């Protein structure tokens, strides 16, 4: 249970809502888009499918709430670009989603206190249409084309992330300006403190401490817990009394080449003439039309047909090959 040493945490966000930056528990880390099918591998600050007591529960969510981790609902979790996204997998920091055309990715959830937090990152989403037809619903039976997707195998293989120790979690809420002195409120936790002022200016306290004649800005505290592990996040600071000491853990949902069933453009209204071919193209989505001569000079010509179009193509003695979208090339021969 690799989740024994593993744990959750918090990070910073560039957009928590209405263009304002804050420290969000749903902070975005890495948005992977290696899959050719359109599936996005989103890395978040919180953990999904695990409870605060370290137990598997698919309906529950684990997020960081002011120094302590708290439980939330799986139904409250949402992903969106320009319109809502369909979630196709959740485990720990990772979310799998199929999103429409967008310029900014948004990931959010709802807590126990009925308060919604969401992180927005600028990301140009535009999956490369598979095939030559822009369909919405996937067919059960169709043309087999090579593509890529993230598999649902949980097995510890292939891909891996770097995890380091979370020495002492910084917390400014532990210090308070008591008139002209600084009070350190422990709240049944082991706190490591350091101050610029005289007298006691270092140590590891288990009890409430007070620093005489000092300011909150000239002090620093943080909870200790060098017993849990943390992932190498750029949104979390590096451990002070540590160089490049780090660990590594295998990650689920790897990228693998698969097969996708696409469609084919509808045949156009074809009428023959004296050494020429007339085509009435009716495309439902942007369809590519290409043609070449079957002789010495091929003279390749390509054009993206989008609207109702009539094309007149000259057919030489050698022959003319016309390719209309994902359909097999149509061969034409004149004579006489």
């Amino acid at each position: 249970n690799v989740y024994k040493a593993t744990r959750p945490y918090l990070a910073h966000c560039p957009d928590c809502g209405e263009g304002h930056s804050c420290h969000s528990p749903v902070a975005l880390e890495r948005i992977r888009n290696e899959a050719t099918d359109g599936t996005l591998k989103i890395q978040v600050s919180l953990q999904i499918g695990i409870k605060t007591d370290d137990s598997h529960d698919w309906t529950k969510l684990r997020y960081m709430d002011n120094h302590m981790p708290a439980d939330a609902e799986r139904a409250g979790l949402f992903v969106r670009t320009s319109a809502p996204c369909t979630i196709t997998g959740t485990m720990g920091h990772f979310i799998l989603a199929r999103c429409p055309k967008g310029e900014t990715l948004t990931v959010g959830f709802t807590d126990s206190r009925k308060i919604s937090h969401s992180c927005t990152h600028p990301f140009h989403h535009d999956p490369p249409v598979i095939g030559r037809e822009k369909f919405h619903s996937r067919p059960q039976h169709g043309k087999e084309l090579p593509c890529s997707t993230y598999v649902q195998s949980t097995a510890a293989t292939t891909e891996e992330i770097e995890v380091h120790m979370p020495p002492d979690t910084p917390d400014r809420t532990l210090m308070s300006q008591q008139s002209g002195n600084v009070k350190i409120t422990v709240n049944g936790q082991t706190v490591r403190y350091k101050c610029n002022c005289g007298g006691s200016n270092e140590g590891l306290t288990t009890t409430d401490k007070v620093i005489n004649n000092c300011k909150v800005d000239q002090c620093h505290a943080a909870v200790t817990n060098h017993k849990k592990w943390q992932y190498n996040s750029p949104l979390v600071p590096r451990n002070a009394e540590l160089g490049d000491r780090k660990g590594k853990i295998h990650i689920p949902f790897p990228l693998a080449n698969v097969t996708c069933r696409v469609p084919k453009a509808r045949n156009p209204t074809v009428t023959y003439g004296k050494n020429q071919v007339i085509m009435l193209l009716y495309p439902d989505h942007p369809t590519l039309l290409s043609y070449r001569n079957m002789g010495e000079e091929p003279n390749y010509q390509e054009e993206w047909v989008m609207h109702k179009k009539e094309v007149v193509l000259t057919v030489p003695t050698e022959g003319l090959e016309v390719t209309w979208g994902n359909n097999e090339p149509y061969k034409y021969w004149p004579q006489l």
């Binding site: 292939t158 790897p254 990228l255 693998a256 080449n257």
Partner: protein
Amino acid sequence: NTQLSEAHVEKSESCKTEFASAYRAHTASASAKLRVLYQGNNITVTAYA
């Protein structure tokens, strides 16, 4: 205070699956298929040209 920012470039995990191969073509070997109507019966012959 100071901040050390270190970085390096590696092959992605996808390189085993998603990759393009750069080949150097030298000479080619031809191999085929001919139909022959020998003694009122069609026979298939496949040989190197």
